[PDB]
Each structure stands twice: as structure tokens, then as C-alpha cells.
Amino acid sequence: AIFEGKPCINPPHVVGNYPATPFLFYIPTSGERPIKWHAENLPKGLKLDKETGIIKGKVVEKGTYKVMLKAENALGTDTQELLINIGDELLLTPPMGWNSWNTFGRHLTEELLLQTADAMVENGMRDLGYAYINIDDFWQLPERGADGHIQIDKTKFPRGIKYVADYLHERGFKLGIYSDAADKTCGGVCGSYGYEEIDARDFASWGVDLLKYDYCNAPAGRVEAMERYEKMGRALRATDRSIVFSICEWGQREPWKWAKKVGGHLWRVSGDIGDLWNRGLRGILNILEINAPLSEYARPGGWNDPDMLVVGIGGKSKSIGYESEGCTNEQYQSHFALWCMMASPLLCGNDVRQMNDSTLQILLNKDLIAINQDPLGIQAERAIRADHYDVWVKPLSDGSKAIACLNRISGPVDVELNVKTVEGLSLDRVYDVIEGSLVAEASTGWVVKLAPGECKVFICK
């Protein structure tokens, strides 16, 4: 369905990059192929490839630039604005992508990465804005090299990391990598403590676009953590690239308060997510509890990270299959929907090379993703935490509001929705985002009926 019909230029409609750093953006575009793209008003230093939809180059001057994009095919055309903010901020919308950890663990290969990029090109995800392809732990060897450089495991990446980066950038993808603020990662292979500048330089030379920085084997002290993250954050900013800094100390030291100060763009708020509803240790519902009161700390350029998506894993995993039950599809959809409402990173953890329709139905929901990528970048408020359900509210950039009603229990639940449910709610026009259709219930409100584990998401104006 993504590759049928008139073109449609999908979010994000706003992108940020540091000045004088490499710039790369594939324009996510639904519609029948082939498509041809046009851009009017691209800033100095950027060029569009009209046949591939990739904007590439480098803008030296700080600024906000409004580019008009057009995509055309045999059935018609779509015209849309791209706001390019060349500035002090990255991730003006939440990062979307895939991470190697939740399914593959230490079974990384160059083959997996290139095949994952190819799948995303061909399966719809790239055209819905999934861009970051992130290497997690175990790409490197256990010991630092005798020359003081971190060693790529060349049984896994026999042409090195840059080869993968190059391949990914050819298709508009971003490369993520992983290290740890200690001598050893969570997995026991080489970390970066004390070598931040030399590792950041290497990362940059390989074309890395994102660093996840873990905290295993580091001392628990909050000041010690802050200093260690600051070292790496400054090292990343001293390179010639815009590198996303993903902070990963499991929320233990309230990173939402200090992560932006040490140069982070996203920060883990909890321990590691499991493929389970409610307690590879934290359940989906436990993570919601943690993240709910943190909505004031998120905004364009800095997001609360409730960890990687477990949509589509169904218990099957070489990293978290041990301590994980598998969820219902209802529960997976509620998981994705809530990650979208919370302006969370949408980093898939399943094997995107092969997906069932039920998984595709969730991860390719353009409307939920559109909520996630709303340029206001407000993390939804959990307006009401009742005994059996939640009501969450996300103001959107056209003045509408997204409302999510979630059933947290294993029996059916009724949730009354009316104009006093949350501040400033209008119900004259209500769109059901999971069904993709207008709701024909009363403008004075109605009872939402939720099956066990079900979330309903409405856009309300």
C-alpha cells in the first residue's frame, strides 16, 4: 500500500544538523514507483538527486531554511515543505530506525546490516522515516589495540565499519554504533573510558552518525556519571560530524535533568526493556510508569528514551528471549502507539528482513508515526492514570490533540471521553488512527470500549 497511489511526502518535515558537517536526508515518500523528486530553495551546499530522493552536502552557515519538495509519479504529485535547521540541535523529531540488540545480541555481521538496510528500502520503513541503523554491543574486540585504538571485530565486519556506513549513506540511512563509559562494555568487550577523543575521532572517520554510550562497569556516583558523559559529549562535538549522543545509564541518575547539559540528544529513562507486558527485565507498562512524569524534559532536540521497540519479536530472540514471554498483537500495538505518543525514539528491535502482516500493520502505521514526528515534539502527558486505564494527551502542531486511551488490565474496560476529560479537548471532529477513519460518535463524548491490552488513539479537534 506504501508503494501505490499518488506520491505522499512523509514526515519528518523538519530536520536539524550542525553547521559545516556532512548533511544527508532521504525524503520519505509513499506512492507508486518510479518517483522523481524536485527541490526549490535548497540552501547553499546541498544538492538533491532527483532519481533517488536523497539530499546531500554540507551547509556552512547557521540558519533555518525552508525548502519546497515535490514528488511526482504516473498518478500525480505531492508538494511539501522541508524545514532545515542548521544549528546547535540534532533530532528535531524523535529518531526512528533499528537496533541490532533485541533480536541478534552478539550475532552481528556486515551481512546483517546491509540486508537490514535493503529490507528497509524495499519494505516501506524508509519511506515512513525510519533512518537510523544502529550497531549495538559486540562489534569490537575485547581488548584495545596496542596502538591505542579500539579494534573492529573483522570476523563480523571484514571490510570495517566505514564500509557499512558508506553503504547505508548511499541509501539515506544513518549509522549508529555503541561503546561504554568504562574499560569494558556491558558485554565484556572494549569500551572508551579515558580514550574518548581517540574513539570519537575514529567514529567520525568511519562516518558514524550516532553513538549509544552505556554505563556498565562504571562507578554509580552521579557526578562521576555526569563527568564521564560530558567527556564523550565534548569529544563527539570536537569531530567534523554531527553525531547523535544517546546516553544509556538506565535512568538511575535522573539523566533527564542533566543529559542535555553534557551534549546528549536522548537518554534512557529505565532499565532494559523486555519482550513482556508487565514485570530483558522491564515490561512495557513499567516503562510507561517511569516515563509518564518526565514529559516536561522532552522537546525538539532532546528526548526521553523508553528503550528499543519489541514489536514483532514474539519471544524469539538471541539477546532477550530468556527473560521474556512474548506479547499479544494488541499489546504490541499499544506499545508502538504509546512510544509514538511519548515522542519516543522508534528504534525497532525485531528482524525487519522478514515480518508478518500483523507486525507490518503496526510499524508502518503512518498516522501514529506522524504523531511521533509532530514538529512540536511534545511528549504526551498522562492526563489521567485511573486504576485500570490511562488517558494520554499530545498537543499537535495544527492545534488538534492526540488522545490515547489505554487498557492496562487483562479484562475489558470502559473509558468515558468528553470535553472535560482533559484540558482544551474538542470532540467535534475525531479521527481513529488505528482504524484510519472518522469516528461518528457524539460531539458531546462517548464511552470508549477497550479490549484487554488495547489502546485506541484518536486525533481530536
Side-chain angles (χ1 to χ4, degrees), residues 178-235:
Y178 167 101
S179 194
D180 190 294
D183 58 332
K184 298 298 175 102
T185 69
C186 294
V189 295
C190 191
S192 287
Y193 183 70
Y195 299 88
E196 298 89 349
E197 284 74 15
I198 199 101
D199 294 357
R201 163 139 67 264
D202 281 357
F203 294 157
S205 76
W206 306 332
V208 165
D209 301 305
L210 178 147
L211 178 70
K212 179 183 166 178
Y213 203 47
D214 217 335
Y215 204 63
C216 280
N217 304 302
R222 182 156 161 166
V223 177
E224 181 78 48
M226 279 169 69
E227 286 171 0
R228 291 192 182 202
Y229 276 104
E230 188 190 336
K231 258 148 64 84
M232 181 53 100
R234 282 187 290 94

Short mmCIF file of all heavy atoms in Angstrom, two decimals, residues 178-235:
data_model
loop_
_atom_site.label_atom_id
_atom_site.label_comp_id
_atom_site.label_asym_id
_atom_site.label_seq_id
_atom_site.Cartn_x
_atom_site.Cartn_y
_atom_site.Cartn_z
N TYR A 178 28.15 1.79 19.20
CA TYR A 178 27.98 1.61 20.62
C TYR A 178 29.31 1.53 21.33
O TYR A 178 30.27 0.93 20.86
CB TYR A 178 27.17 0.35 20.85
CG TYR A 178 27.15 -0.18 22.27
CD1 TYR A 178 26.06 0.06 23.10
CD2 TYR A 178 28.21 -0.90 22.76
CE1 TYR A 178 26.04 -0.41 24.39
CE2 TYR A 178 28.20 -1.42 24.05
CZ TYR A 178 27.10 -1.19 24.86
OH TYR A 178 27.11 -1.69 26.13
N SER A 179 29.38 2.16 22.50
CA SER A 179 30.51 1.96 23.40
C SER A 179 29.99 2.13 24.82
O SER A 179 28.78 2.12 25.06
CB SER A 179 31.61 2.94 23.06
OG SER A 179 32.83 2.58 23.67
N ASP A 180 30.92 2.27 25.76
CA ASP A 180 30.60 2.23 27.19
C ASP A 180 31.59 3.10 27.90
O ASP A 180 32.76 3.12 27.55
CB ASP A 180 30.66 0.78 27.68
CG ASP A 180 30.11 0.57 29.09
OD1 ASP A 180 30.69 1.09 30.05
OD2 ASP A 180 29.11 -0.15 29.23
N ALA A 181 31.13 3.83 28.91
CA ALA A 181 31.98 4.75 29.68
C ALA A 181 32.79 4.02 30.79
O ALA A 181 32.76 4.38 31.97
CB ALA A 181 31.14 5.87 30.27
N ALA A 182 33.51 2.99 30.35
CA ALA A 182 34.36 2.19 31.19
C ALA A 182 35.40 1.56 30.30
O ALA A 182 35.45 1.80 29.08
CB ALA A 182 33.53 1.13 31.91
N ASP A 183 36.23 0.70 30.90
CA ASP A 183 37.15 -0.13 30.15
C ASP A 183 36.42 -1.22 29.36
O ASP A 183 36.87 -1.60 28.31
CB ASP A 183 38.21 -0.75 31.08
CG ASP A 183 37.60 -1.59 32.20
OD1 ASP A 183 36.44 -1.34 32.65
OD2 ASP A 183 38.29 -2.51 32.63
N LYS A 184 35.29 -1.67 29.87
CA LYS A 184 34.51 -2.78 29.25
C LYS A 184 33.01 -2.48 29.15
O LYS A 184 32.40 -1.91 30.05
CB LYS A 184 34.71 -4.07 30.06
CG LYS A 184 36.14 -4.59 30.11
CD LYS A 184 36.65 -4.93 28.71
CE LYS A 184 38.11 -5.34 28.69
NZ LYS A 184 38.20 -6.81 28.58
N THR A 185 32.44 -2.87 28.02
CA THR A 185 31.02 -2.74 27.78
C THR A 185 30.25 -3.71 28.67
O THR A 185 30.86 -4.58 29.33
CB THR A 185 30.65 -3.07 26.33
OG1 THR A 185 30.83 -4.50 26.05
CG2 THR A 185 31.47 -2.23 25.39
N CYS A 186 28.93 -3.54 28.69
CA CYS A 186 28.03 -4.49 29.37
C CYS A 186 28.34 -5.91 28.97
O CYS A 186 28.34 -6.76 29.80
CB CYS A 186 26.55 -4.15 29.08
SG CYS A 186 26.10 -2.55 29.82
N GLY A 187 28.69 -6.13 27.71
CA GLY A 187 29.05 -7.45 27.21
C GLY A 187 30.47 -7.96 27.47
O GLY A 187 30.77 -9.10 27.15
N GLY A 188 31.35 -7.12 28.00
CA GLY A 188 32.74 -7.51 28.25
C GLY A 188 33.72 -7.27 27.10
O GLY A 188 34.83 -7.82 27.10
N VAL A 189 33.34 -6.45 26.12
CA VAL A 189 34.31 -6.08 25.07
C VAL A 189 34.72 -4.59 25.27
O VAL A 189 34.37 -3.96 26.26
CB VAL A 189 33.81 -6.45 23.64
CG1 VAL A 189 33.69 -7.98 23.48
CG2 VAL A 189 32.50 -5.77 23.31
N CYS A 190 35.56 -4.08 24.39
CA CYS A 190 36.31 -2.87 24.69
C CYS A 190 35.40 -1.67 24.78
O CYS A 190 34.57 -1.47 23.89
CB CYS A 190 37.41 -2.61 23.64
SG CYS A 190 38.60 -1.33 24.09
N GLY A 191 35.60 -0.87 25.83
CA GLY A 191 34.93 0.44 25.98
C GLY A 191 35.86 1.62 25.76
O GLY A 191 36.98 1.46 25.28
N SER A 192 35.38 2.80 26.10
CA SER A 192 36.01 4.07 25.70
C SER A 192 36.55 4.96 26.82
O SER A 192 37.13 6.00 26.55
CB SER A 192 35.00 4.89 24.89
OG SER A 192 34.78 4.38 23.59
N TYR A 193 36.36 4.60 28.08
CA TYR A 193 36.79 5.49 29.17
C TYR A 193 38.26 5.83 29.10
O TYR A 193 39.11 4.93 29.03
CB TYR A 193 36.53 4.89 30.56
CG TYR A 193 36.92 5.85 31.63
CD1 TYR A 193 36.17 6.99 31.85
CD2 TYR A 193 38.07 5.67 32.38
CE1 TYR A 193 36.54 7.92 32.80
CE2 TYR A 193 38.45 6.58 33.34
CZ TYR A 193 37.67 7.70 33.54
OH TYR A 193 38.04 8.61 34.50
N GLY A 194 38.55 7.13 29.16
CA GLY A 194 39.90 7.63 29.06
C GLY A 194 40.40 7.79 27.63
O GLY A 194 41.46 8.33 27.43
N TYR A 195 39.67 7.24 26.63
CA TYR A 195 40.06 7.31 25.21
C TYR A 195 38.96 7.94 24.38
O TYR A 195 38.80 7.64 23.21
CB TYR A 195 40.34 5.90 24.66
CG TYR A 195 41.45 5.17 25.35
CD1 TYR A 195 41.21 4.40 26.48
CD2 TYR A 195 42.76 5.22 24.85
CE1 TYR A 195 42.25 3.71 27.11
CE2 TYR A 195 43.79 4.52 25.48
CZ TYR A 195 43.52 3.78 26.60
OH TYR A 195 44.53 3.09 27.22
N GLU A 196 38.20 8.83 24.99
CA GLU A 196 37.03 9.35 24.33
C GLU A 196 37.38 10.10 23.04
O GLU A 196 36.64 10.04 22.05
CB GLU A 196 36.24 10.26 25.29
CG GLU A 196 35.70 9.55 26.54
CD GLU A 196 36.65 9.52 27.72
OE1 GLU A 196 37.87 9.88 27.57
OE2 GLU A 196 36.20 9.09 28.82
N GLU A 197 38.49 10.83 23.06
CA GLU A 197 38.82 11.71 21.94
C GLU A 197 39.27 10.85 20.80
O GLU A 197 38.86 11.07 19.67
CB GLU A 197 39.93 12.73 22.26
CG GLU A 197 39.52 13.90 23.12
CD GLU A 197 39.31 13.53 24.58
OE1 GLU A 197 39.75 12.43 25.01
OE2 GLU A 197 38.68 14.34 25.31
N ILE A 198 40.12 9.88 21.10
CA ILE A 198 40.62 8.98 20.06
C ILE A 198 39.48 8.10 19.49
O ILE A 198 39.39 7.94 18.28
CB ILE A 198 41.85 8.18 20.50
CG1 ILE A 198 42.61 7.64 19.27
CG2 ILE A 198 41.48 7.06 21.42
CD1 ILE A 198 43.85 8.44 18.88
N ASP A 199 38.57 7.61 20.33
CA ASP A 199 37.44 6.84 19.79
C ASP A 199 36.46 7.72 18.97
O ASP A 199 36.01 7.33 17.91
CB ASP A 199 36.72 6.10 20.91
CG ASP A 199 37.57 5.00 21.55
OD1 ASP A 199 38.71 4.74 21.13
OD2 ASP A 199 37.10 4.41 22.53
N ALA A 200 36.17 8.93 19.44
CA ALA A 200 35.27 9.80 18.71
C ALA A 200 35.84 10.16 17.35
O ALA A 200 35.12 10.24 16.36
CB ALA A 200 35.01 11.06 19.51
N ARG A 201 37.15 10.39 17.29
CA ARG A 201 37.82 10.66 16.01
C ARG A 201 37.69 9.46 15.08
O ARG A 201 37.37 9.62 13.92
CB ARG A 201 39.31 11.00 16.23
CG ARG A 201 40.21 10.91 14.99
CD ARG A 201 41.23 12.04 14.86
NE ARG A 201 42.25 12.02 15.90
CZ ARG A 201 42.23 12.74 17.02
NH1 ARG A 201 41.23 13.57 17.30
NH2 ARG A 201 43.23 12.62 17.89
N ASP A 202 37.94 8.27 15.60
CA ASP A 202 37.78 7.08 14.80
C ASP A 202 36.34 6.98 14.28
O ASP A 202 36.11 6.79 13.10
CB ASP A 202 38.16 5.83 15.61
CG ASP A 202 39.68 5.63 15.70
OD1 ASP A 202 40.40 6.44 15.08
OD2 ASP A 202 40.14 4.64 16.34
N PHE A 203 35.37 7.16 15.17
CA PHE A 203 33.94 7.04 14.82
C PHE A 203 33.59 7.97 13.70
O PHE A 203 32.99 7.55 12.70
CB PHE A 203 33.04 7.30 16.06
CG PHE A 203 33.17 6.27 17.16
CD1 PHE A 203 32.82 6.60 18.48
CD2 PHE A 203 33.61 4.97 16.91
CE1 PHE A 203 32.92 5.69 19.50
CE2 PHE A 203 33.69 4.03 17.93
CZ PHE A 203 33.37 4.39 19.23
N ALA A 204 33.99 9.23 13.85
CA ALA A 204 33.81 10.20 12.81
C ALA A 204 34.45 9.82 11.47
O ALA A 204 33.79 9.92 10.41
CB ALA A 204 34.34 11.56 13.27
N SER A 205 35.71 9.37 11.50
CA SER A 205 36.37 8.91 10.27
C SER A 205 35.65 7.72 9.59
O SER A 205 35.71 7.59 8.37
CB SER A 205 37.85 8.57 10.53
OG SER A 205 37.98 7.32 11.19
N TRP A 206 34.97 6.87 10.37
CA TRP A 206 34.18 5.79 9.80
C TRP A 206 32.80 6.25 9.29
O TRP A 206 32.08 5.46 8.70
CB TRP A 206 33.96 4.63 10.78
CG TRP A 206 35.19 4.07 11.37
CD1 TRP A 206 36.46 4.06 10.81
CD2 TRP A 206 35.30 3.35 12.59
NE1 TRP A 206 37.35 3.39 11.63
CE2 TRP A 206 36.67 3.01 12.75
CE3 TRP A 206 34.40 3.03 13.60
CZ2 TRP A 206 37.13 2.34 13.88
CZ3 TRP A 206 34.86 2.40 14.69
CH2 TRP A 206 36.20 2.04 14.83
N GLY A 207 32.42 7.52 9.52
CA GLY A 207 31.11 8.00 9.07
C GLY A 207 29.96 7.71 10.00
O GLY A 207 28.80 7.73 9.58
N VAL A 208 30.28 7.41 11.26
CA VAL A 208 29.26 7.19 12.30
C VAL A 208 28.38 8.43 12.48
O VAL A 208 28.88 9.56 12.53
CB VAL A 208 29.94 6.78 13.63
CG1 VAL A 208 29.01 6.89 14.81
CG2 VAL A 208 30.46 5.36 13.51
N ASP A 209 27.07 8.19 12.64
CA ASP A 209 26.12 9.24 12.83
C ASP A 209 25.49 9.27 14.22
O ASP A 209 24.84 10.27 14.60
CB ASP A 209 25.01 9.05 11.80
CG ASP A 209 25.54 9.09 10.39
OD1 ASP A 209 26.22 10.11 10.03
OD2 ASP A 209 25.30 8.12 9.65
N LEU A 210 25.65 8.20 14.98
CA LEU A 210 25.06 8.09 16.30
C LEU A 210 25.91 7.18 17.23
O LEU A 210 26.40 6.14 16.78
CB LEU A 210 23.65 7.54 16.20
CG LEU A 210 22.89 7.34 17.51
CD1 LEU A 210 21.40 7.59 17.29
CD2 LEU A 210 23.08 5.95 18.11
N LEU A 211 26.09 7.62 18.48
CA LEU A 211 26.72 6.83 19.50
C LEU A 211 25.79 6.60 20.69
O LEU A 211 25.36 7.54 21.33
CB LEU A 211 28.02 7.47 19.99
CG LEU A 211 28.71 6.70 21.11
CD1 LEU A 211 29.29 5.39 20.63
CD2 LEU A 211 29.81 7.53 21.74
N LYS A 212 25.54 5.33 20.98
CA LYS A 212 24.90 4.91 22.19
C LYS A 212 26.03 4.68 23.17
O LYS A 212 27.00 3.97 22.85
CB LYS A 212 24.05 3.67 21.91
CG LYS A 212 23.32 3.09 23.11
CD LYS A 212 22.57 1.83 22.75
CE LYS A 212 22.13 1.08 24.01
NZ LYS A 212 21.33 -0.17 23.70
N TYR A 213 25.95 5.29 24.34
CA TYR A 213 27.06 5.25 25.30
C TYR A 213 26.56 4.65 26.63
O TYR A 213 25.85 5.27 27.42
CB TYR A 213 27.66 6.65 25.43
CG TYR A 213 29.11 6.72 25.94
CD1 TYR A 213 30.09 5.91 25.40
CD2 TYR A 213 29.48 7.65 26.89
CE1 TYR A 213 31.39 6.00 25.81
CE2 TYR A 213 30.80 7.78 27.30
CZ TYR A 213 31.76 6.96 26.77
OH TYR A 213 33.07 7.07 27.20
N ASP A 214 26.92 3.38 26.86
CA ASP A 214 26.43 2.62 28.01
C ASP A 214 27.27 2.89 29.27
O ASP A 214 28.30 3.53 29.21
CB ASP A 214 26.44 1.12 27.68
CG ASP A 214 25.26 0.38 28.26
OD1 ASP A 214 24.67 0.82 29.27
OD2 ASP A 214 24.94 -0.68 27.67
N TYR A 215 26.80 2.41 30.41
CA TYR A 215 27.40 2.74 31.70
C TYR A 215 27.77 1.49 32.53
O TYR A 215 27.98 1.60 33.74
CB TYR A 215 26.48 3.72 32.48
CG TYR A 215 27.24 4.54 33.49
CD1 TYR A 215 28.23 5.42 33.08
CD2 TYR A 215 27.02 4.43 34.86
CE1 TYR A 215 28.99 6.14 33.98
CE2 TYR A 215 27.78 5.16 35.77
CZ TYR A 215 28.74 6.04 35.29
OH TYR A 215 29.54 6.80 36.13
N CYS A 216 27.83 0.31 31.93
CA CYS A 216 28.30 -0.86 32.67
C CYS A 216 29.69 -0.64 33.17
O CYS A 216 30.47 0.05 32.52
CB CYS A 216 28.32 -2.12 31.83
SG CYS A 216 26.66 -2.76 31.76
N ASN A 217 29.97 -1.24 34.32
CA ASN A 217 31.32 -1.24 34.91
C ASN A 217 31.84 0.13 35.31
O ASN A 217 33.03 0.26 35.60
CB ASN A 217 32.35 -1.89 33.94
CG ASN A 217 31.93 -3.26 33.53
OD1 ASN A 217 31.76 -4.09 34.37
ND2 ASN A 217 31.72 -3.50 32.24
N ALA A 218 30.97 1.15 35.28
CA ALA A 218 31.34 2.47 35.77
C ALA A 218 30.82 2.70 37.16
O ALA A 218 29.83 2.12 37.56
CB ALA A 218 30.80 3.53 34.85
N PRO A 219 31.48 3.59 37.93
CA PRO A 219 31.03 3.84 39.29
C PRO A 219 29.65 4.55 39.33
O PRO A 219 29.37 5.40 38.49
CB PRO A 219 32.14 4.75 39.86
CG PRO A 219 33.26 4.72 38.89
CD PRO A 219 32.61 4.45 37.57
N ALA A 220 28.83 4.19 40.32
CA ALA A 220 27.44 4.63 40.41
C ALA A 220 27.24 6.15 40.63
O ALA A 220 26.18 6.70 40.28
CB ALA A 220 26.77 3.89 41.52
N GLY A 221 28.24 6.81 41.21
CA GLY A 221 28.15 8.24 41.54
C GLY A 221 27.62 9.13 40.40
O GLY A 221 27.99 8.95 39.23
N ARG A 222 26.71 10.02 40.76
CA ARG A 222 26.01 10.84 39.80
C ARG A 222 26.94 11.87 39.16
O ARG A 222 26.90 12.10 37.97
CB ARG A 222 24.86 11.53 40.48
CG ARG A 222 24.04 12.39 39.53
CD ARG A 222 22.64 12.54 40.08
NE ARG A 222 21.93 13.67 39.50
CZ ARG A 222 20.62 13.85 39.63
NH1 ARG A 222 19.88 13.00 40.33
NH2 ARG A 222 20.04 14.87 39.06
N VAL A 223 27.80 12.47 39.97
CA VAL A 223 28.81 13.38 39.45
C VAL A 223 29.80 12.63 38.58
O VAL A 223 30.17 13.11 37.52
CB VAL A 223 29.54 14.15 40.58
CG1 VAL A 223 30.64 15.02 40.01
CG2 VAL A 223 28.53 14.99 41.36
N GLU A 224 30.20 11.42 39.00
CA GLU A 224 31.10 10.61 38.18
C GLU A 224 30.47 10.30 36.81
O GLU A 224 31.13 10.40 35.75
CB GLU A 224 31.46 9.33 38.91
CG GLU A 224 32.42 8.44 38.16
CD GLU A 224 33.86 8.92 38.24
OE1 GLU A 224 34.33 9.23 39.34
OE2 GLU A 224 34.52 8.97 37.17
N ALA A 225 29.20 9.94 36.83
CA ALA A 225 28.49 9.70 35.58
C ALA A 225 28.44 10.95 34.69
O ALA A 225 28.77 10.90 33.49
CB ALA A 225 27.09 9.20 35.86
N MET A 226 28.07 12.06 35.28
CA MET A 226 27.93 13.29 34.52
C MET A 226 29.24 13.66 33.86
O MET A 226 29.24 14.07 32.68
CB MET A 226 27.47 14.42 35.42
CG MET A 226 25.96 14.31 35.62
SD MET A 226 25.38 15.53 37.06
CE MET A 226 25.68 17.25 36.20
N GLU A 227 30.35 13.52 34.59
CA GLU A 227 31.67 13.88 34.06
C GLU A 227 32.06 12.99 32.92
O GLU A 227 32.64 13.46 31.96
CB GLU A 227 32.74 13.81 35.14
CG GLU A 227 32.61 14.98 36.09
CD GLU A 227 33.49 14.89 37.31
OE1 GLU A 227 34.24 13.90 37.46
OE2 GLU A 227 33.45 15.83 38.14
N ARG A 228 31.77 11.69 33.04
CA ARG A 228 32.12 10.73 32.00
C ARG A 228 31.31 10.94 30.73
O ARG A 228 31.85 10.84 29.65
CB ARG A 228 31.94 9.29 32.50
CG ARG A 228 32.96 8.90 33.55
CD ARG A 228 32.97 7.40 33.82
NE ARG A 228 33.93 7.09 34.87
CZ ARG A 228 34.51 5.91 35.08
NH1 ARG A 228 34.23 4.86 34.32
NH2 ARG A 228 35.38 5.80 36.07
N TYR A 229 30.04 11.24 30.86
CA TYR A 229 29.21 11.54 29.72
C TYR A 229 29.68 12.86 29.09
O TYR A 229 29.77 12.98 27.87
CB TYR A 229 27.71 11.51 30.13
CG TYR A 229 27.16 10.08 30.10
CD1 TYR A 229 26.95 9.37 31.27
CD2 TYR A 229 26.97 9.41 28.91
CE1 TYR A 229 26.51 8.06 31.25
CE2 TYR A 229 26.53 8.07 28.88
CZ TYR A 229 26.31 7.41 30.05
OH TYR A 229 25.86 6.09 30.03
N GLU A 230 30.04 13.82 29.91
CA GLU A 230 30.49 15.13 29.39
C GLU A 230 31.78 15.00 28.57
O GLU A 230 31.95 15.66 27.55
CB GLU A 230 30.66 16.13 30.52
CG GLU A 230 30.93 17.54 30.02
CD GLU A 230 31.34 18.52 31.10
OE1 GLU A 230 31.01 18.28 32.28
OE2 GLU A 230 32.02 19.52 30.75
N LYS A 231 32.70 14.15 29.02
CA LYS A 231 33.93 13.89 28.28
C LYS A 231 33.60 13.41 26.88
O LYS A 231 34.15 13.92 25.89
CB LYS A 231 34.83 12.86 29.00
CG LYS A 231 36.00 13.49 29.73
CD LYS A 231 36.43 12.74 31.01
CE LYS A 231 36.97 11.32 30.79
NZ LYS A 231 38.42 11.24 30.42
N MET A 232 32.73 12.41 26.77
CA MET A 232 32.40 11.86 25.45
C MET A 232 31.57 12.81 24.62
O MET A 232 31.72 12.85 23.41
CB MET A 232 31.66 10.53 25.61
CG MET A 232 31.31 9.88 24.27
SD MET A 232 32.86 9.68 23.06
CE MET A 232 33.25 7.79 23.39
N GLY A 233 30.70 13.60 25.27
CA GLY A 233 29.87 14.55 24.56
C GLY A 233 30.70 15.64 23.92
O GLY A 233 30.49 15.99 22.75
N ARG A 234 31.66 16.16 24.67
CA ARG A 234 32.61 17.13 24.13
C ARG A 234 33.51 16.52 23.03
O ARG A 234 33.78 17.17 22.01
CB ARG A 234 33.47 17.75 25.26
CG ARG A 234 32.74 18.83 26.05
CD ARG A 234 33.57 19.59 27.07
NE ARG A 234 33.96 18.78 28.23
CZ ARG A 234 35.11 18.11 28.36
NH1 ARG A 234 36.04 18.12 27.41
NH2 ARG A 234 35.35 17.41 29.48
N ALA A 235 33.97 15.29 23.22
CA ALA A 235 34.76 14.60 22.19
C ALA A 235 33.96 14.45 20.88
O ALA A 235 34.48 14.74 19.79
CB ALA A 235 35.23 13.23 22.67
#
